[PDB]
Amino acid sequence: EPVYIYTSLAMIPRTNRLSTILTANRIPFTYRDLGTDDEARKVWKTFSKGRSLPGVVRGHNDLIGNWEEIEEANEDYKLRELIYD
Amino acid sequence: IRKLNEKEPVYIYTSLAGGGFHMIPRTNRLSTILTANRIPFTYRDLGTDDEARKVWKTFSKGRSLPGVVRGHNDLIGNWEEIEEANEDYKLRELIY
């Protein structure tokens, strides 16, 4: 399943940190800009439960976590949380 | 398999970490033009998007980024070609 970093390009530098963490864990990703991407907007609004952007989404609508949660999985180094939910 | 009975998606191919000459201002200008013609789009970042990178390398003919692409690989035009066209665009994306 493809992995995305949900963002708002017009969110904050935190996107760059997220990108660095995924690359470090050899996780390929592409960006999704909620400023222009209605699918991403729908997914983030439905599932974020008020969590702030940015974040990581797998496939069409599997919200893995926002930046803070991704940070947390990374210091536990279980960021490959996102392939097993 | 792919979904039927819908419009081909439209992309602005760009490089979000810049580098390319006037990459961000030209991207911003492209965005304004597409929005002006009421054309929905998403960005493709060639820095992280390998297929978008491959598409541009194959079809750009040396044209500089950013540009507009329809579907998987229908390069409509780069920023300059798109700039000139700003008479009717809808015709070049939807009628072609």
Curated annotation (Swiss-Prot), chain B:
Transmembrane segments: none annotated. Residues 1-96 form the Glutaredoxin domain. It comes from the Eukaryota. Present with 704 molecules/cell in log phase SD medium. This is Uncharacterized protein YFR016C. It comes from Saccharomyces cerevisiae (strain ATCC 204508 / S288c). The lineage of its organism: Eukaryota, Fungi, Dikarya, Ascomycota, Saccharomycotina.
